[PDB]
Amino acid sequence: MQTDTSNRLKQIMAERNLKQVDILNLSIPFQKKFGIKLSKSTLSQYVNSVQSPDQNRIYLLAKTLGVSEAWLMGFDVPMV
């Protein structure tokens, strides 16, 4: 596709003034809620586009940031 998960995370970091450390912080309550872990290292791998998130982390980050899963995956759809 045209857009990556990497691109979307970067779009959110810029538009919402969040660094990776902030996003990771926001996710922790949801990590415990869902019982699904996201480490700092793995998050940077998503941002730098070295790794693409599995469907577990797509859901996690999407609920954390309040965006749609499809959007977060890079698809050309509405954000909310």
Numbering used by the authors: 1 to 80
Please give sentences taken from the publication describing this entry.
TP901-1 is a temperate bacteriophage of Lactococcus lactis that enters either the lytic or the lysogenic lifecycle when infecting a bacterium. In the TP901-1 bacteriophage a genetic switch exist, and is regulated by two divergently oriented promoters PL and PR, three operator sites on the DNA (OD, distant located operator; OL, left operator; OR, right operator) and two proteins, the Modulator of Repression (MOR) and the repressor, CI (known as Clear I in λ phage). CI from TP901-1 consists of an NTD responsible for DNA binding and a CTD responsible for oligomerization. The full-length protein has been shown to be a hexamer in solution, where CTD is responsible for the oligomerization state of the protein.
Co-crystallization experiments with DNA were also carried out both with CI∆58 and CI∆43. One of the crystals diffracted significantly better, however turned out to contain only protein (DNA was absent). Furthermore residues beyond Val80 were not visible suggesting that the better diffracting crystals were obtained because of limited proteolysis occurring during the long crystallization period. The resulting crystal structure is essentially the CI-NTD domain, well described in12, but contains six additional C-terminal residues compared to the previous structure, and is hereon denoted NTD80. The six additional residues mainly consist of hydrophobic amino acids and interact closely with the rest of the domain. The extended region is stabilized by hydrogen bonds of the Phe75 backbone carbonyl oxygen with the side chain of Arg8 and the backbone amide of Val77 as well as Met79 π-interactions with Trp71 and a hydrogen bond between the carbonyl group of Met79 and the backbone N of Ser68. The extended CI-NTD crystal structure as well as the NMR relaxation data also precisely identifies residues 81–89 of TP901-1 CI as a flexible linker, while residues 75–80 should be included in the CI-NTD. The crystal structure of the CI-NTD fits well within the envelope in terms of dimensions. Next, we generated a large pool of possible conformers (400.000 copies) using the crystal structure of CI-NTD80 and the model of the dimerization region. The MOR binding has been suggested to take place in a region including part of the scaffolding helix (α2), and a region including the last two helices of NTD.
